[PDB]
Design a protein around this ligand. Sequence first.
Ligand SMILES: Cc1cc2nc3c(=O)[nH]c(=O)nc-3n(C[C@H](O)[C@H](O)[C@H](O)COP(=O)(O)O)c2cc1C
Length: 356
Amino acid sequence: NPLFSPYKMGKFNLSHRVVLAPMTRCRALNNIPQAALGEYYEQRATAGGFLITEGTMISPTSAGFPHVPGIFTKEQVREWKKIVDVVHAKGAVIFCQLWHVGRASHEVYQPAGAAPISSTEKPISNRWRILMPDGTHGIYPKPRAIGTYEISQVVEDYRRSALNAIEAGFDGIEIHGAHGYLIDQFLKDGINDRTDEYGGSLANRCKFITQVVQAVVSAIGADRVGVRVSPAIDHLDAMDSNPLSLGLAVVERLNKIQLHSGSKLAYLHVTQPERLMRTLRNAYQGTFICSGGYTRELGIEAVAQGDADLVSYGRLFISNPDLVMRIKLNAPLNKYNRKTFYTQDPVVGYTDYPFL
Ligand SMILES: Cc1cc2nc3c(=O)[nH]c(=O)nc-3n(C[C@H](O)[C@H](O)[C@H](O)COP(=O)(O)O)c2cc1C
C-alpha cells in the first residue's frame, strides 16, 4: 500500500501519507481551545502521522463561525500548548491552520458589531447564508474594502499568529488561502474588483497571498509553512474566470518564494470540489497534498500515480478516529452525521464516534 510508505515532509519524516484535513468543528468555546479539542486530536493522532488543525483565528476580526479557536492571545497559546503536547506524545506532527474569513462574517462575530473586511465592498450574494451562534442561518453583510495600510496590518496578524503557533509547540502552520475566505477574496477575479496594486492582473491578485506567505516564512522558516488553495471551488461566490491560470499563477509565486529564501515550503495543499490537480502538482517544486472527495482507493491511486505525495481526508476523519488504521486494514468506515459538524457539545458528534 503506497499510502504507508514513509515520506519526508522536509525535516518531518512521516510514517504514512494519510493526513487529517483542517476541519472547523466549533467546540473551542469563546475562541479558547478546550480540553475536548485535545481528546479529539489525540484520538486521530498516529505515530508519524500528520494532522492539520481546524481554521484558527489570527485576530479579533478574523472569525465568521462560532466557537472557533484563536491563536492571537497568550491565553489561547497556553491552551493550545496542552493540546499540542498530547498529540506530540502520540508521535504525530501537527500544523495549525491560520484562518481569516474576510467578508464571510456577520456583525455577531465582529467586535462592536463592525462590518467584516475584504478586498471589496461586494457582499456574498443571498444564495449563501451564514451559520449564527443560535444555530439559525443569517445574511452575509456588506464588507468594508481595506486600503493597503490595513492589508499590511493583516499580514502582520498572520506573522504574529505564526510565531504564537510556534510558541505553543506546533510543528508549523498552514495558510488558509481557500474556500472563498479572505485570501481567496483577493485571488479570485469574481470577487476582487480593486483598481489598485492588489487588483486586476494575476500578479496584483497574487500579491496578498505572496505577502502573507513571505511574512510567515521569514518569521518561522519555510519548512514550517504549508499553503492551502482551491482555485476551482466556487464556495461563497468565489469564482475565477480561469481557475487553472489562477492556480498556476499562485504556484509561480510559491516557487519564487522558495528560490529567494533558499528553502522549500512544507507543502502546497490543493482542494477540489466534490486534470487540474495534477497540473498544479507538476508545476509546484515541492511536496503536494491533494484533498477533496478522496477515498481509500482514490488516495492509493493518487500516490501510486505520482499525483500527490500526501492525501488529506476530512469528512471520513470526523467519523473514523482511527481512519489511518482502517485504511491500512481496508476495514469498513463509519458514517458521519452532518447535524453535529458545527455543534458545541464536547462529546456528542465529536469524540463519541467509535474505534474499530
Ligand atoms: C465540517 C467541515 C469543516 C471544515 N473546516 C475547514 C477548515 O477549517 N479549513 C479548511 O481549509 N477546510 C475545511 N473544510 C474542508 C475540508 O478540509 C476538506 O477539504 C473537505 O471536507 C473535502 O474533503 P473530504 O471529501 O475528505 O471531506 C471543512 C470541511 C467540513 C466538512
